[PDB]
């Protein structure tokens, strides 16, 4: 276990949050060149 | 489209499906979303396959299938004996990441 | 010798390259991989990988997360979810984000949010410790 | 004198316990390295542990010598 | 006094026993360092176990110094 | 005089034996520190075998004290 | 008589080596803790090797105490 | 006597030498435990290597045991 | 002679050195087990170090046995 | 005379403590080997810790040998 | 004589100092096995540190032997 898993997060979520942080912490120039190719548009449908 | 083509036979076997694919280029965020919605769904799958269309060339593509496993298989796979620092924590975090990786690779192909 | 492969989803830095030593972080503990390191699997933690070519040159890439595999045939594969060279970051943004996260961790809205904020905290903390 | 002789005998076996300290310190100053190898992001914070791991490690050592003091002059 | 000399040599032999406690505490407080390097999030548990073991091993050194006093005095 | 001198010296020799139990007790309570850092979710299960090692390392020290008392008083 | 005195001293010096068995048992059980934490699934076999090594180091230590008993009585 | 009695303490102080052999064998078997835990597949060979370290350390202790029993009987 | 007795006293109190030998050999052949289990591939070069260290420490311990035999027989 | 007897006993039994300093040097350098076989990039900071541990550990053996010198010369 | 017996017993009770040195050698050459087994490429580098630790730790046990021979022959 790890401090971020006791709640029950999957390592996918860990990487996702860390990546969002590293994205937020970039130059003002590279923000425009990194905000793209970073988001998500997929959405789920009830089964 | 995949959901529809298989909603006559194999209609019941659906576990979850996603839309708005291909409208914009996929990203690792989309693969992470698919992996999350797979793991959270209380299905303890013991094996899996992913079918996609590998892009051979502008004229040809091949319907490829890549296998995927679960930490219960990796643990009991004797071939893993030669990898050190392998408990059931790093191994299955690595398995989650591997699932996301294969999903993203298939999305791009 | 070592066949290195460092590749973010967006970009690829090394493809079957031949470097001498590569220092990588990890959940268990940051450690170095050399031309015969015993096979291992690990998942990275917010840190900075350091590569050294066959010669005495160096290069530092800050990686958010990922997985580093060392194989029987001496082939390192370091797949990082977000690998950026240090020259792409700014201090104040990361520092303010870290301080904000520390401020909000007092607000134990729930354990899941506590963990999320903790991850953001030590992420930005590795950022500053790399840039401070 | 037999009394001074016994004082010396006890002194010889009162400084042997210092070997204990010799191991103790080493173990800590072994582990530290290991720790500092696996996690350079806790260097400073490790120092405190180390110094603690030194003090209480040499503690018994000194106290062993204390007995020697006594067994020489008490 | 031959018997006082015998008491002295007995105390000198006995006081060494604290070297075992010294070695044990060295082990405990090196394991603390490396374990804290691996799993920092649980520092509070690490101190709990470390101090519990520290006193629980100081048992022996205190026993040995006590018996040194007891042979000397009692 | 020499008989009680032997009492004293032999008891002092016996009292030393608990040093090894000190080393072992420290070893087991460093091992618990590590094994808890590595897999925290097995606290009590690890603690059971840890206290088993406590008992089976205290055996030696308490037997050494037993022999010390016996040879100082019998 | 000095013969009885030397006999006490011999027994008291021989009954200190069980420190070795104590340290060995402590190390074995620490290793048991660590191995179990590594692989919680495999505890029986780990415990099997642990009890075997335990009991055999116990045999060595109790052999030391048997020699102590003999020298006291012969 | 003194020289026919000091042999008793000679043998005792020689027999104390087995403590380190005990500790060595203990750490050998703890290492066996950890090694098996890491790589449970290697169950066969690890026990043989144990037996080897076992035998060598116990023989090193037997050296002092025989030295003591020499003090008592062969002086 | 009182020398004919102190000779045996020294022999007995000197052969104890083999304890640390035994411990060193035990540590070496434990570390060999961990090393080989972790990385079974490079089996052979592990021996080129294990046997080297074992024989080396064993010889340096046997120095004390040599000294004991020297005094007891010269 | 017996005064010189106790002198020599004390000188002989004081030096034994250096065993702990030897073991401390051994364990600290083994820890350096491991912690540099994990993260070789450092070194320029580990070897400092190893040398510091050398100074600290050999201090104990130095103390024991100086005690032996003082007990055999005053 | 009491004085010659004194010198011989001093040598005998000093020689034991080699135990800690032997344990240190064993620890160093176990650490070398583990370190090399993890990261083989570092071999010829780890070997320097480990053999240096060997010699520069057995220096202590050889100091004990040197003082033992000093007492015996001087």
Author numbering:
A (entry chain I): 1 to 47
B (entry chain G): 111 to 219
C (entry chain H): 15 to 146
D (entry chain P), E (entry chain O), F (entry chain N), G (entry chain M), I (entry chain K), J (entry chain Q), ...: 1 to 74
H (entry chain L): 1 to 75
Can you quote the paper on this entry?
The dimeric enzyme, inhibited by residues 1 to 60 of regulatory protein IF1, was purified in the presence glycodiosgenin, Brij-35, and phospholipids, and its structure was determined by cryo-EM of single particles. As it rotates, the asymmetrical central stalk brings about structural changes in the three catalytic sites, found mainly in each of the three β-subunits, which alternate with three noncatalytic α-subunits in the spherical extrinsic domain. These structural changes lead sequentially at each catalytic site to the binding of the substrates ADP and phosphate, followed by the formation and then the release of ATP. The inhibition of ATP hydrolysis in the isolated catalytic F1-domain arrests the rotary cycle at the catalytic dwell, and in structures of the inhibited bovine F1-IF1 complex, the rotary cycle has been arrested at 27° to 32° after the pause in the rotary cycle preceding the release of phosphate. In the current structure, the postphosphate release angles are 28.8°, 26.2°, and 25.5° in states 1 to 3, respectively. Therefore, the rotational angle in the F1-domain is not influenced significantly by interactions with the additional components of the intact enzyme that are absent from the isolated F1-domain. The PS is an essential component of the enzyme’s stator linking the α3β3-sphere of the F1-catalytic domain to the membrane-associated wedge and the adjacent a-subunit into the stator subcomplex against which the rotor turns. During catalysis, it prevents the dissociation of the α3β3-domain from the central stalk by clamping it in position from above, and it resists the rotational torque of the central stalk, preventing the α3β3-domain and the rest of the stator domain from following the direction of rotation. A cap provided by the N-terminal domain of the OSCP is linked to the N-terminal extensions of the three α-subunits and adjusts its connections in concert with the rocking of the α3β3-domain during a catalytic cycle.
